[PDB]
Amino acid sequence: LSTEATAKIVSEFGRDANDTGSTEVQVALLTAQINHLQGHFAEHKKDHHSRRGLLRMVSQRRKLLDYLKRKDVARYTQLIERLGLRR
RNA sequence: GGGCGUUAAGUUGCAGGGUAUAGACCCGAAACCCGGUGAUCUAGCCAUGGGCAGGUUGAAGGUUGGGUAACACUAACUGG
Ligand SMILES: [Mg+2]
Ligand SMILES: [Mg+2]
Ligand SMILES: [Mg+2]
Ligand SMILES: [Mg+2]
Ligand SMILES: [Mg+2]
């Protein structure tokens, strides 16, 4: 992912624009990467070697979302509403 | 010597018997060729119009909500 894009996401989701390790920041980065690779996997359908990384990112995002939902539901709902997710 | 002849009158008309060529005592074919008439029936094609009551199952597809990182998949409705 682009360094400028990562910096923009960190500034948008974090507090001091330097934590860059919060659950919301990680989920946003994973979602952005998945959405960017959506167009890559819509053409190269025989790229399972890179699709495994996408699946790993999906699993990591799901685990982070479950942890956020278990810890603070208020932040989880706001994050999913902002990112357009459904669960 | 042997074969063919010599030694011995035919021809022209009429009538008739017979033969040949023509259809040839008479009727009767399936069939061949040439020139014409027929697609108002029927076979096909083209152009232009008309007709198929009523009652049935419910395909592709299209929204809705979930189900996927999303395509798939799947529930109802609609669709005809
Ligand atoms: Mg002599
Ligand atoms: Mg005489
Ligand atoms: Mg005579
Ligand atoms: Mg005619
Ligand atoms: Mg009818």
Coordinates of C-alpha atoms (C1' of nucleotides) and ligand atoms in Angstrom, one line a residue:
Chain A
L1 CA 0.0 0.0 0.0
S2 CA 1.1 3.6 -0.7
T3 CA 2.9 5.4 2.1
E4 CA 0.7 8.5 1.5
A5 CA -2.5 6.4 1.7
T6 CA -1.3 4.8 4.9
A7 CA -0.5 8.2 6.4
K8 CA -3.9 9.6 5.4
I9 CA -5.7 6.6 6.9
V10 CA -3.7 6.9 10.1
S11 CA -4.5 10.6 10.3
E12 CA -8.2 9.9 9.7
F13 CA -8.7 7.1 12.1
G14 CA -6.1 7.5 14.9
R15 CA -5.6 10.2 17.5
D16 CA -2.0 11.6 17.2
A17 CA -1.5 10.4 13.6
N18 CA 1.5 8.4 14.9
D19 CA 0.0 5.4 16.8
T20 CA -0.6 3.6 13.5
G21 CA -1.3 0.4 15.5
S22 CA -4.8 0.8 16.7
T23 CA -7.5 -1.7 15.9
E24 CA -9.5 0.9 13.8
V25 CA -6.4 1.9 11.9
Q26 CA -5.5 -1.8 11.1
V27 CA -9.0 -2.6 10.1
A28 CA -9.2 0.5 7.8
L29 CA -5.8 -0.4 6.2
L30 CA -6.9 -4.0 5.6
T31 CA -10.2 -2.9 4.1
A32 CA -8.5 -0.4 1.8
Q33 CA -6.1 -3.1 0.7
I34 CA -8.9 -5.6 0.1
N35 CA -10.9 -3.0 -1.9
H36 CA -7.8 -2.1 -4.0
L37 CA -7.2 -5.8 -4.7
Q38 CA -10.8 -6.3 -5.7
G39 CA -10.0 -5.0 -9.1
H40 CA -6.8 -7.0 -9.3
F41 CA -8.5 -10.3 -8.6
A42 CA -11.4 -9.4 -11.0
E43 CA -8.9 -9.9 -13.9
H44 CA -6.2 -12.3 -12.7
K45 CA -8.4 -15.1 -11.5
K46 CA -5.5 -17.6 -11.4
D47 CA -3.5 -15.8 -8.7
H48 CA -4.2 -17.9 -5.7
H49 CA -0.7 -17.3 -4.5
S50 CA -1.6 -13.7 -3.9
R51 CA -5.2 -14.5 -3.0
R52 CA -4.0 -16.4 0.1
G53 CA -2.6 -13.0 1.4
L54 CA -6.0 -11.5 0.8
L55 CA -7.6 -14.3 2.7
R56 CA -5.1 -13.8 5.6
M57 CA -5.9 -10.1 5.6
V58 CA -9.6 -10.9 5.8
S59 CA -9.1 -13.3 8.7
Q60 CA -7.0 -10.7 10.5
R61 CA -9.7 -8.0 10.0
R62 CA -12.4 -10.4 11.2
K63 CA -10.4 -11.2 14.4
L64 CA -9.8 -7.4 15.0
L65 CA -13.5 -6.7 14.5
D66 CA -14.5 -9.4 16.9
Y67 CA -12.0 -8.1 19.5
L68 CA -13.4 -4.5 19.0
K69 CA -17.0 -5.7 19.3
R70 CA -16.2 -7.6 22.5
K71 CA -14.3 -4.7 24.0
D72 CA -16.1 -1.5 22.9
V73 CA -19.3 -2.0 20.8
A74 CA -19.7 1.8 20.4
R75 CA -16.4 2.1 18.4
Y76 CA -17.1 -1.1 16.4
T77 CA -20.5 0.2 15.2
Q78 CA -19.0 3.6 14.2
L79 CA -16.1 1.9 12.4
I80 CA -18.4 -0.5 10.4
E81 CA -20.8 2.4 9.6
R82 CA -17.9 4.5 8.3
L83 CA -16.3 1.7 6.3
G84 CA -19.6 0.5 4.9
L85 CA -19.2 -3.0 6.2
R86 CA -22.2 -5.2 7.2
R87 CA -20.7 -7.4 10.0
Chain B
rG1 C1' -14.3 -87.1 -124.8
rG2 C1' -17.7 -84.1 -121.2
rG3 C1' -21.2 -79.6 -119.9
rC4 C1' -24.7 -75.7 -122.7
rG5 C1' -27.1 -75.3 -127.0
rU6 C1' -28.6 -76.3 -132.8
rU7 C1' -32.5 -79.8 -134.7
rA8 C1' -39.1 -77.0 -133.6
rA9 C1' -42.9 -69.6 -133.8
rG10 C1' -43.4 -65.7 -131.4
rU11 C1' -45.7 -61.1 -130.4
rU12 C1' -49.6 -57.6 -129.3
rG13 C1' -54.7 -56.8 -126.6
rC14 C1' -58.9 -58.9 -123.7
rA15 C1' -60.5 -62.2 -119.4
rG16 C1' -58.7 -65.1 -115.5
rG17 C1' -55.0 -68.0 -111.8
rG18 C1' -50.4 -66.7 -109.2
rU19 C1' -46.0 -63.3 -107.6
rA20 C1' -43.5 -58.3 -106.4
rU21 C1' -43.9 -53.0 -104.8
rA22 C1' -47.4 -49.9 -102.5
rG23 C1' -51.7 -50.0 -96.1
rA24 C1' -52.9 -54.9 -99.5
rC25 C1' -58.9 -59.8 -96.8
rC26 C1' -60.9 -56.7 -92.2
rC27 C1' -60.7 -54.8 -86.9
rG28 C1' -57.5 -54.8 -82.5
rA29 C1' -52.3 -53.3 -79.4
rA30 C1' -49.0 -52.3 -75.4
rA31 C1' -45.4 -48.7 -77.5
rC32 C1' -41.6 -44.5 -80.5
rC33 C1' -40.9 -39.5 -82.5
rC34 C1' -42.3 -34.2 -83.7
rG35 C1' -45.1 -29.8 -82.9
rG36 C1' -48.3 -27.6 -79.4
rU37 C1' -52.1 -27.0 -74.4
rG38 C1' -52.0 -27.3 -69.3
rA39 C1' -49.3 -25.3 -61.6
rU40 C1' -57.8 -22.7 -61.5
rC41 C1' -56.7 -30.2 -58.6
rU42 C1' -52.1 -31.4 -56.6
rA43 C1' -45.9 -30.8 -55.3
rG44 C1' -42.6 -26.9 -54.2
rC45 C1' -41.4 -21.5 -54.0
rC46 C1' -42.5 -15.9 -53.8
rA47 C1' -45.5 -11.4 -52.8
rU48 C1' -49.7 -9.5 -50.0
rG49 C1' -53.8 -10.2 -46.0
rG50 C1' -56.6 -13.1 -42.6
rG51 C1' -57.4 -17.2 -38.5
rC52 C1' -56.2 -20.2 -34.1
rA53 C1' -62.8 -19.9 -28.1
rG54 C1' -61.6 -21.4 -23.4
rG55 C1' -59.0 -23.6 -19.4
rU56 C1' -53.6 -25.2 -17.4
rU57 C1' -47.8 -26.0 -15.4
rG58 C1' -44.7 -22.1 -14.6
rA59 C1' -38.3 -21.3 -17.8
rA60 C1' -34.7 -17.3 -18.5
rG61 C1' -34.7 -12.7 -16.1
rG62 C1' -35.9 -8.5 -12.4
rU63 C1' -36.4 -6.2 -7.5
rU64 C1' -36.4 -7.3 -1.4
rG65 C1' -33.8 -9.3 2.9
rG66 C1' -30.1 -12.0 4.7
rG67 C1' -25.0 -15.5 2.7
rU68 C1' -19.8 -14.5 1.0
rA69 C1' -13.4 -10.0 1.5
rA70 C1' -17.1 -10.8 -3.4
rC71 C1' -18.8 -13.8 -7.6
rA72 C1' -21.2 -18.0 -6.4
rC73 C1' -25.1 -20.1 -3.7
rU74 C1' -29.8 -19.9 -1.5
rA75 C1' -35.9 -18.0 0.7
rA76 C1' -40.4 -15.3 -1.0
rC77 C1' -42.7 -12.0 -4.7
rU78 C1' -42.9 -10.7 -9.6
rG79 C1' -42.1 -12.1 -14.4
rG80 C1' -44.9 -15.3 -18.7
Ligands
MG1 MG -15.2 -81.9 -129.7
MG2 MG -51.3 -66.5 -130.1
MG3 MG -51.6 -61.3 -114.6
MG4 MG -48.5 -22.4 -68.2
MG5 MG -56.4 -18.4 -25.1

